[PDB]
């Protein structure tokens, strides 16, 4: 991993969030201090989804010359807590499909001359 997968331990934060968040450090996709204090902070106060949401979408950022990427992510997190709770803004953004699978129910048979049945 790397040396900052510890700091986010002792900063306030969940294991569950840290592991998540040294691959972002491991990648290649910031330069350790990619963000600032004002970022760190906004950062300190989730829930359990809340950073996971976050470090989501900014793994998938269009990161190749951002010269702040303090400011995109200060930008996602202003955004995901629509489906979290009614304390954001309607911004755009595109998760959550259609569909949904059975996965806990059951058929059922009979044969009969009242009954579709094969």
């Known amino acids: 991993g790397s040396e900052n997968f510890q700091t986010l331990l002792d900063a306030g934060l969940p294991q569950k969030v840290a592991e998540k968040l040294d691959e972002i450090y491991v990648a290649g996709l910031v330069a350790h201090s990619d963000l ?6 906004a950062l300190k106060e989730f829930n359990e989804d809340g950073a996971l949401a976050v470090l989501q979408q900014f793994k998938d950022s269009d ?5 702040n990427k303090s400011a995109f992510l200060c930008g996602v997190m202003k955004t995901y807590r629509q489906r979290e709770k009614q304390g954001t803004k309607v911004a755009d953004s595109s998760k959550g499909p259609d569909e949904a699978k059975i996965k806990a129910l059951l058929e059922r048979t009979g044969y009969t001359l009242d009954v579709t049945t094969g």
């Open 63 to 67: 990161l190749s010359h951002v010269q």
């Open 36 to 41: 600032d204090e004002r970022a760190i902070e």
